[PDB]
Design a protein around this ligand. Structure first.
Ligand SMILES: *C/C=C/c1ccc2c(c1)C(C)(C)c1cc(N(CC)CC)ccc1-2
Length: 133
């Protein structure tokens, strides 16, 4: 349950608006983003990950190495500098993004066919579920 490789199609997405609002995403943009279908493509090779999140109007790409802190500029999101770090906690993949926002990051649980993703910012959690295509 440590293998996140694949093309992942969205099944559910709860509190997406609250999480985007916690990041200060423009209100008008949030209402469009709530309509867009999101696809998550992950390439995982040892510690090296390439993550690509795509919609009609929006893309979010990030590459990282597990265990290696990296400077991140969330240019397509809230446009902030964070110090990001992705590590394993048992079978959970955990990202912490140190910076202005508290409790910022995500956690991924892979259970065979399904990927559970919890994105956090401040007091908000967005819960997403994907199924491998
Ligand atoms: C393990 C996957 C982590 C991860 C990081 C960043 C994002 C995501 C998943 C998505 C797919 C939830 C996502 C969507 C968005 N947009 C909404 C504002 C759409 C492209 C941004 C960042 C991430």
């Amino acid at each position: 349950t440590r293998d996140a490789n694949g093309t992942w199609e969205m099944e559910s997405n709860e509190n997406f608006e609250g999480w985007m609002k916690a990041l200060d995403i423009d209100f008008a943009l949030r209402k469009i983003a709530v309509r867009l279908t999101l696809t998550l493509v992950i390439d995982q090779d040892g510690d090296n990950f390439k993550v690509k999140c795509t919609s009609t109007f929006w893309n979010y790409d990030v590459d990282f190495t597990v265990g290696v802190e990296f400077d991140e500029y969330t240019k397509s999101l809230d446009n902030r500098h964070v110090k990001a770090l992705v590590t394993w906690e048992g079978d959970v993949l955990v990202s912490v993004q140190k910076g202005e926002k508290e409790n910022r990051g995500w956690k991924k649980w892979i259970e065979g066919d399904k990927l559970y993703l919890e994105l956090t910012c401040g007091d908000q959690v967005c819960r997403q579920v994907f199924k491998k295509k």
